[PDB]
């Protein structure tokens, strides 16, 4: 029963996210749009974090790699160091 990883981001899970965002009613096409948006979000951030990993000569992406990538994308995160 092979399944694409992005589809692992399921309808109910996207439904829950919308709910926290105060959304009452959701169009069937929203689930695919959301996955695309998440993909671009993660590409942009992971790209930069990996770039930090490579610079340090590591094979492990660290929380700090991620925290620094988030800071420069203007999405500062508190709770994981720095």
């Amino acid at each position: 029963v092979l399944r694409d990883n992005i589809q692992g981001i399921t309808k109910p899970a996207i439904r829950r996210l919308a709910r926290r965002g105060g959304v009452k009613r959701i169009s069937g096409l929203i689930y695919e749009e959301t996955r695309g948006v998440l993909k671009v979000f993660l590409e942009n951030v992971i790209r930069d974090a990996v770039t930090y990993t490579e610079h340090a000569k590591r094979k492990t992406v660290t929380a700090m790699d991620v925290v620094y990538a988030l800071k420069r994308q203007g999405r500062t995160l508190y709770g994981f160091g720095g």
């Binding site: 930069d48 770039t51 930090y52 490579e54 610079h55 340090a56 700090m64 620094y68 420069r72």
Partner: protein, 95 residues
């Protein structure tokens, strides 16, 4: 009667290289000068941070290179990286 540096003559040199019969207005030059300063500050800054993050006191062409990859989009990064590598490689063999 204090001296005020700019990248003007260098911008003009490069301009003649690419469009030998084209000039530049002083306002356009002012904008070119601002752009160069701006990108300089953005790359040096990333380099600065990167160095701090790795507990290093030295900014080397390696720091600049990561800064370039962090700052520039896709294809501009790729090409800036070649041009910078090329210049340093050439520079190393030239003394």
């Amino acid at each position: 009667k204090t001296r005020k540096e700019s990248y003007a003559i260098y911008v003009y040199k490069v301009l003649k290289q690419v469009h030998p019969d084209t000039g530049i207005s002083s306002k356009a030059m002012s904008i070119m000068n601002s752009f160069v300063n701006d990108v300089f500050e953005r790359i040096a800054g990333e380099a600065s941070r990167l160095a701090h993050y790795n507990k290093r006191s030295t900014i080397t062409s390696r720091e600049i290179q990561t800064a370039v990859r962090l700052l520039l989009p896709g294809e501009l990064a790729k090409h800036a990286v070649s041009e910078g590598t090329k210049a340093v490689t050439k520079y190393t063999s030239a003394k």
